[PDB]
Amino acid sequence: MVDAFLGTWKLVDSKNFDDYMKSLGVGFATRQVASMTKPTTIIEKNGDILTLKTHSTFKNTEISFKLGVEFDETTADDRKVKSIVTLDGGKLVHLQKWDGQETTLVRELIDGKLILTLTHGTAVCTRTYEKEA
Numbered sequence: 001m002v003d004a005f006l007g008t009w010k011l012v013d014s015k016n017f018d019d020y021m022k023s024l025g026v027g028f029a030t031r032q033v034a035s036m037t038k039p040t041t042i043i044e045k046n047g048d049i050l051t052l053k054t055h056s057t058f059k060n061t062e063i064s065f066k067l068g069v070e071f072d073e074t075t076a077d078d079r080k081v082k083s084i085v086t087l088d089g090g091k092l093v094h095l096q097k098w099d100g101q102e103t104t105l106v107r108e109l110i111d112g113k114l115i116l117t118l119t120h121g122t123a124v125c126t127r128t129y130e131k132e133a
Ligand SMILES: CCCCCCCCCCCCCCCC(=O)O
Pocket: 011, 021, 026, 030, 034, 037, 039, 041, 054, 055, 056, 058, 059, 060, 061, 075, 076, 077, 116, 127
């Protein structure tokens, strides 16, 4: 039920990503480079396994998961977390837990653009991705 999310997407706007990274304890030099990086996110499915690739000139990640089933993840900033991804209100909600902390990565389609909202602590970052053909 994840189908409109599938494809290759390019970052076209970012708000408050420095605040989100700083909340997670990312150091200033990594924040600096990240603030100038425009990732490509690729979301594919094979049966009920999703694979989400994030590619850039700086960091690169890949995760595979089944919705609703917890998985181990090592994030771009090297946090080792317990993760689960579900559909909720038509949004793809990715929850990461580690050391009693949590962060959510929520993706929603609005007017054909994929809006990624990242929340940790009080920090709320909104990143807009546009689909590639
Ligand atoms: C894979 C590219 C990551 C770029 C930024 C690296 C340092 C901060 C990492 C924070 C967690 C992951 C944020 C993902 C943001 C996104 O997908 O647009």
